[PDB]
Amino acid sequence: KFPVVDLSKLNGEERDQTMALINEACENWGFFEIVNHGLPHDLMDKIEKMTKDHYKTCQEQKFNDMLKSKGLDNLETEVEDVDWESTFYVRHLPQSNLNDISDVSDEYRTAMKDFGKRLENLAEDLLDLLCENLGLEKGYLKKVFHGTKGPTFGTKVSNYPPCPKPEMIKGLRAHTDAGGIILLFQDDKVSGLQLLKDGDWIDVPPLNHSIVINLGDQLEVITNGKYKSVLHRVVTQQEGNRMSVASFYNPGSDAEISPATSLVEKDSEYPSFVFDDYMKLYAGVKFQPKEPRFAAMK
Amino acid sequence: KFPVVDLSKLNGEERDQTMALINEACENWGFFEIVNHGLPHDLMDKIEKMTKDHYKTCQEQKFNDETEVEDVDWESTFYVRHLPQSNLNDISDVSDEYRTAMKDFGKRLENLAEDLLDLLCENLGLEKGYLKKVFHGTKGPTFGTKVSNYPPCPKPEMIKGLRAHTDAGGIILLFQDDKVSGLQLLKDGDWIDVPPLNHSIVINLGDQLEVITNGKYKSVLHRVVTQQEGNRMSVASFYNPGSDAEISPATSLVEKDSEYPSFVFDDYMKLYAGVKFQPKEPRFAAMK
Amino acid sequence: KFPVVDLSKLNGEERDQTMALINEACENWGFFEIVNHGLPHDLMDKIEKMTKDHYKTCQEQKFNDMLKSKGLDNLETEVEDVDWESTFYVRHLPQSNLNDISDVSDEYRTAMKDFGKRLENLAEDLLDLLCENLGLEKGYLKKVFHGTKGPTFGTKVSNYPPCPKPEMIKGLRAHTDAGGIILLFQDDKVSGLQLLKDGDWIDVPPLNHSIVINLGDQLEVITNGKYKSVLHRVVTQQEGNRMSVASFYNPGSDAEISPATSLVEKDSEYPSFVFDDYMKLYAGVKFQPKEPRFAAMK
Amino acid sequence: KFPVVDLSKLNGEERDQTMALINEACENWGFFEIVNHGLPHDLMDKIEKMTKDHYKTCQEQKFNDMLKSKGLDNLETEVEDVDWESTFYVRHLPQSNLNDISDVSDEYRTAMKDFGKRLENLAEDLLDLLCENLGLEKGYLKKVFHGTKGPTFGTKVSNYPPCPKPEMIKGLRAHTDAGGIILLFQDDKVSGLQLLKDGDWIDVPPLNHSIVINLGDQLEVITNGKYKSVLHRVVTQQEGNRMSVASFYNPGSDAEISPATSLVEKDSEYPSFVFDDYMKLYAGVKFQPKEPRFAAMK
Amino acid sequence: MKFPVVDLSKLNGEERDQTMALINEACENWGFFEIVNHGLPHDLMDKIEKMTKDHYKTCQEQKFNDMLKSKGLDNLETEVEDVDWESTFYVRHLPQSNLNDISDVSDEYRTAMKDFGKRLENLAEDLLDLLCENLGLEKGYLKKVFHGTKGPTFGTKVSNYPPCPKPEMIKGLRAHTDAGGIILLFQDDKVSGLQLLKDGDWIDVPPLNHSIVINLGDQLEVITNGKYKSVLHRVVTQQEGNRMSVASFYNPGSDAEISPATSLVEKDSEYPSFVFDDYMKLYAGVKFQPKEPRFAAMK
Ligand SMILES: O=C(O)c1ccccn1
Ligand SMILES: O=C(O)c1ccccn1
Ligand SMILES: O=C(O)c1ccccn1
Ligand SMILES: O=C(O)c1ccccn1
Ligand SMILES: O=C(O)c1ccccn1
Ligand SMILES: [Zn+2]
Ligand SMILES: [Zn+2]
Ligand SMILES: [Zn+2]
Ligand SMILES: [Zn+2]
Ligand SMILES: [Zn+2]
């Protein structure tokens, strides 16, 4: 059963049990859903509606332009080198480009700014729960992530349109995320996101007004492997356009990333590096195995 | 024999024959095809190619939406405005290349429309630019393009691609499929095919030119029929008077009292929208 | 000015003028287009339509698989030994293989059979006009071409898909045709076929519902050089997929080919041979000079 | 310091810094000189000699004829409506008139033809360097310039003879060039060409065996203002006849010119138009401000 | 993208700060603005307009038709880029008035023109003082700079743009920037035609009854070190409508020294320092050529 965490149970004497659920999702799933997370359901509903309307208005034509430009009109053999995906990226931190994206509406930009700020505070709240579960001092992960200019925080807004031949192409090929903590607002009707657990692909179930959390490669390093970043993918379907609004809380470019000493006894197998060196490498090898990227930092 | 006019034959000895053919088509056919019209054949090929491919990606799967159907058109369409103001950069489903080509195509058809109106002026004995002046109104002529496809129909005898009507506006410049037929005009009690022809433009005159010419050039009924296989493309540009243009029979063409009304074009168009497939003649009477 | 012959003008006031024009193209161009040839325009439209749709359904992915098979994905330098071409061949005579091309529909197969029979009759009518212009007896060329089983007649169905860098690769390299008379139904929008005349490449202009005629090597031999087989090529372009349905009316395999004695005063420089010996040689050296193939038949 | 670019440094490990100099000149100067290009110094020396000898034999007459019919033999006061300039034009593309200029020698025409071909290839190589610096796809600008008949390429051969009172008249009044890329072989001793930069006229220094490059109005549109076409003029002097062999690589007549979409964020202030409409208008208003010509294309 | 209209009466009250900020925004971003409630009597504007239009009809219109005849502009076969479709005369007020020397004007027109020009000269100096305040300069700075030895130069260009059968062939007045200081225009309130270039588009300066159009010339661009630029403008013709134009030019005296104000120059200026009459002698010959070479020529 996929972990669903009720964050409102942290405000009372059920808080220890909630923390234990968070910790075991972090150790064994790499993913969990959160409900009662404090984000207004009214804000999620308009983010959802304006994301979908901005797709028809602005992204659908770019998407078909892409399928023509790569011959994906007609899928007669398996395509393992492209994602059946429509995306644009919004940067929040350290410097916002929200007011420079030309094709987004005023009210969409205002909703995205509010949504991004609330998710940034929720990311930092979640990192503190991780710290507590890890036996780290409060604020430890936030301070590691800061670097010189503060954390990097952006939002990937994706749609995975219907695919006539889902067997032939993935919406997004299997990978682990490079960063710190990932907070996903996904479609509540159209499924597609899957994680790999114990040798099976497991669906990340659509759930109304929920946020999906998962941990990236940097948290595997800092926890000395105690919390691993898990492989995940998006599969297409013939009917349905799955919406994806995923926010990435990453260390600053010059943050020093290393295994926390209190989590290391035997010499660590994980490297110590500067985050931007990891991200330069990751961009070119995102869909290749994760383990060579750690070795490359030594 | 359907009139085909070679516009390259206007510069010379050949001009009086050509002008006589244009006038004969305007009086008796209401339609004619033009060749050697100055539009680059590469631009037409790109327009045709991108129109057919945009139907593929953006219109065909929505068009998924036993007896004779007399109230629906078997048609997939979207509209582009050029004048007085263009919404070309606001149509969501069009690519940048298609948009750049339509803008170039639209400007050239606008210049050719005004050249054709000047040929009509000469044949009518009107001063050059007379029809363009009449069409201007306050904000200039209205000019837009209707991009249509008529997909194959299993039972073409049950439904028309587009029911019989006359066009409300001024002059219509049609870039139609050069293989798949379908457009027909009504002449002397017979439906006549408007023959597909490579790199040609089909011209026809609308209701506003019938008024201005005091019936000398009438707007002719036409339709699009479906067929069981073939998707006929249609890129049709409508050069119309401005909304507040005053439309009336040109005085030099009226010796009598005219049976045709004098009105403002937008009053004709508001009425036209609701009664497009009913008879033409009541729309003229309604303007008195 | 590229020769366009109106076959309706044989009926026959300008019939001498039409014949003189045919003769002048045969001597000086090696190519000419014919209009009003008797082939139903609706059959041509069906052939063109089904050929283009059969490419998209069956050849376009095979073509992209061949490109990556041969490394033409990257055209960083000139390719002089490959044609940027998708083709299959249909044999009509003496023995048809129309029923063995498996990915074609019964409608396409029935239309190609009707088209091929009409083109075979037009080929023989054209050969009789050449006979008259050359002063040969009626039916002379048909009789020479017959051999024991009759003429060889087949159709090459080609498409030349768009090429990102057309200056690196040809759709089909320069060559002369080995056979008798070639009847080409080519794309009426997309150009590409060129012939060499007076030291210049001249486009063979797309013309709707026209047939392009050219003379092959066997007619150069029979006419003792009076009608030469002309070099031609297909160039690619970056946008546009030129279709080509080209039918080859050739002598039978065991036909004896020699210069017609009434066209020879001075001893001929051309050989006398059996057609299949010429064809066995031609297959290996098609894109090398033509003149050594004549010498090799002595 | 006026930018001088060594093109031979593109073949090696200094190529990035060379590209950076090119991009800097394109953004901030609109002009740059190139050395170590492909042109043989002996070909430049012969072009220069035969241009100067062709002035004395053929153009000096037409120049004094010009001064006669305009009353410019004695300059009492300023002349702001004529250029103190002797010119003839050589067209190379899409069609050459080189063999139709009556008063040009056989060897001048052969040198002029070889020179033009090398400058045409250098124009296209330089346009690809701009593409790379702009982040556009390879060949982007050449493809935009092509239209139906290919680029327009011609050569303006000018001499600016000595002027008794240089204060009264310019060799060529201030203007921006209408076209794409301009490649100038100018006099290496007699100066005169100046550009306007930061509120000062700056000499374009004569330099042995160099080519001066500048960008025209069409590249400002395509780059959405990132590379502007800058005002330039030729001043006269009392002693010295400055030679000018200027080759203009322009889009084809029916080329569609518009800002490249990857260079546009907010709505562009630059129009989208067909090049020949720009040129019709430019011819009559060449020495009036540039900015109204862009406004006229909307 | 609304054309700026400034209510000058709002300077007398609690909204003076907001009004000054609007004026400053128009100076930086438009180079043009319209003013209302400017203090010129509406009845004087009406008489100027009436007498200007009647003086065209009786005295200028015959000359204009005769001007076309002499230049063969009866027949607009092709585009004319070197002639203005314009009927004009000029009135010099300062330093020396020639008003009593124009022969074909009535005494009533001459008296109204003298009164109109005096009020416009006072309004020009009031506006220059608003610019000074917005620029952080001392009160009277621009008037002092403009004075030279004999005071500012002030004249009025009285123009009509008669109907043109083929407007696409010829402009009423070709695109240019004005050479001088501040330009105060009383234009037709019905017939449009004046346009300015802003952000790559021609923008109509909309006719507005009893308004004055203000624009800044090349000299204020120099003095403000480019903070207020002189903007390109033109007059287009139409097939019917005769646009009237009464434009007054408040310019520095001939021997005035023009340079960027020292408090606006934190690093070396791209703008020259010169004497105004040298700029004007050059400008007369190159008025319809680009502006930027004229600044370079003064160095
Ligand atoms: O696009 C991704 O890589 C993604 C999105 C949401 C959650 C995890 N990963
Ligand atoms: O859609 C129409 O009404 C139409 C289209 C093309 C030509 C004439 N009429
Ligand atoms: O493929 C060929 O060699 C060919 C095709 C058509 C016409 C001439 N030659
Ligand atoms: O004659 C010209 O306009 C020119 C010549 C060379 C370089 C730039 N411009
Ligand atoms: O005549 C001019 O140059 C003018 C007239 C009015 C306003 C601005 N400029
Ligand atoms: Zn991911
Ligand atoms: Zn219609
Ligand atoms: Zn061949
Ligand atoms: Zn120039
Ligand atoms: Zn002015």
| Crossing angle of helices A15-28 and A106-134, rounded to 10° | 90
Element (H, E) at A160: strand A152-160
For chain E, the chains sharing at least 3 beta-carbon pairs closer than 8 angstroms are D
Nearest ligand to the CA of A30 is: 1
Nearest ligand to the CA of E184 is: 5
Q: How far is CA A109 from the centre of its chain?
A: 21
Q: C189-227 as b/e, with b when 16 or more CB fall inside 10 Å?
A: bbbbbbbebeeeebebebbbbbbbbbbbbbbbbbbbbbb
Angle at D273 between CA D270 and CA D274, to 5 degrees: 145
What residues are neighbours of ligand 8 (ion), with CB under 5 Å?
Answer: C 177
Q: How far is the CA of E65 from the centre of ligand 10 (A)?
A: 24
**Closest Cα to residue A41, out of A159, A212, A210, A242?**
A210
- Which letter does DSSP use for residue A205 in this model? -
Element (H, E) at B205: strand B201-205
What count of other Cβ atoms lies within 10 Å of the Cβ of residue A247? 24
**Tokens in use for C140?**
């002379």
Which residues sit opposite A186 in a β-bridge? A244
Tell me the C-alpha distance between A35 and A188, whole Å.
Answer: 13
**Tokens in use for B142?**
């209205």
Tell me the C-alpha distance between D104 and B29, whole Å.
Answer: 58
Helices (H), chain A: 15-28, 41-54, 60-69, 106-134, 140-146, 217-222, 275-284, 291-296
DSSP string, B105-140: HHHHHHHHHHHHHHHHHHHHTPPTTHHHHHHHTTT-
> Could you give the maximum distance between any two Cα atoms of chain B, in Å?
57
Q: Are strands E201-204 and E194-198 parallel, antiparallel or unpaired?
A: antiparallel
For E220, half-sphere exposure in the C-beta direction (CA atoms, 13 angstrom radius) is 32
Terminal Cα distance for chain E, rounded: 36
For chain B, the chains sharing at least 3 beta-carbon pairs closer than 8 angstroms are A, C, D
Angle at B254 between CA B249 and CA B259, to 5 degrees: 65
Angle at C120 between CA C119 and CA C121, to 5 degrees: 90
Tell me the C-alpha distance between B150 and B160, whole Å.
Answer: 10
C182 lines ligand 3 (CB under 6 A): yes
Between the alpha carbon of residue E267 and those of residues A156, D198, E292, the distances in Å are: 44, 13, 20
Q: Which residues of C touch A74 (CB under 8 A)?
A: 56, 60-61
Q: How far is the CA of B186 from the centre of ligand 2 (A)?
A: 14
Between the alpha carbon of residue E91 and those of residues D2, D229, E48, the distances in Å are: 48, 40, 14
Sorted by sequence, the CB contacts under 8 Å of residue D114 that are 6+ apart come out as D43
Resolution of the entry in angstroms: 2.1
What count of other Cβ atoms lies within 10 Å of the Cβ of residue B87? 11
Domain of D1, in residue numbers: 1-298
Q: A55-87 as b/e, with b when 16 or more CB fall inside 10 Å?
A: bebbbbbebbeebeeeebeebeeebeeebbbbb
Breaks (C-N over 2.5 A) in chain B follow: 65
Tell me the C-alpha distance between A276 and B174, whole Å.
Answer: 58
Strands (E), C161-208: 170-175, 181-186, 193-197, 200-203
What count of other Cβ atoms lies within 10 Å of the Cβ of residue B132? 18
Between the alpha carbon of residue C9 and those of residues B44, C125, C131, D269, the distances in Å are: 32, 14, 18, 58
Element (H, E) at B169: none
Tell me the C-alpha distance between B272 and B283, whole Å.
Answer: 7
- Which letter does DSSP use for residue A169 in this model? B
Contact C134, C260 (CB under 8 A): yes
SS3 of residue C216 by DSSP: coil
SS3 of residue B242 by DSSP: coil
Query: Hey, what amino acid is at B274?
Result: G
- The residue to mutate among A31, A158, A177, having the most atoms of ligand 1 within 8 angstroms of its beta carbon, is A177
Tell me the C-alpha distance between C168 and C163, whole Å.
Answer: 9
Q: How far is the CA of B206 from the centre of ligand 7 (A)?
A: 8
DSSP string, E154-206: EEEEEEEE---S-GGG-EEEEEE--SSSEEEEEE-SS---EEEEETTEEEE--
What count of other Cβ atoms lies within 10 Å of the Cβ of residue D238? 9
**Closest Cα to residue C101, out of C112, C93, C85?**
C112
Chain C contact residues (CB < 8 Å to A): 56, 60-61, 64-65
Cβ contacts from A onto D, under 8 A: 4
Please tell me the total count of domains within chain A.
1
Query: Which residues lie with the beta carbon below 6 Å from any ligand 2 atom?
Result: B 146, 162, 167, 172, 174, 204, 222, 234, 236
Tell me the C-alpha distance between D166 and D84, whole Å.
Answer: 9
**Tokens in use for B14?**
């050949």
Q: Which residues of D touch E286 (CB under 8 A)?
A: 80
Q: Are strands D31-35 and D4-6 parallel, antiparallel or unpaired?
A: parallel
CATH code of the domain covering residue D114: 2.60.120.330
SS3 of residue B259 by DSSP: coil
| Plot region of C10 (φ>0 → left; ψ -120 to 50 → alpha; else → beta) | alpha
Q: Do A74 and C64 touch (CB under 8 A)?
A: no
Tell me the C-alpha distance between E115 and C188, whole Å.
Answer: 77
What CA dihedral angle connects A127, A132, A137 and A142, to 10 degrees?
0
Element (H, E) at D171: strand D170-175
Residue A42 burial (C-beta neighbours within 10 Å; 0-12, 13-18, 19+): exposed
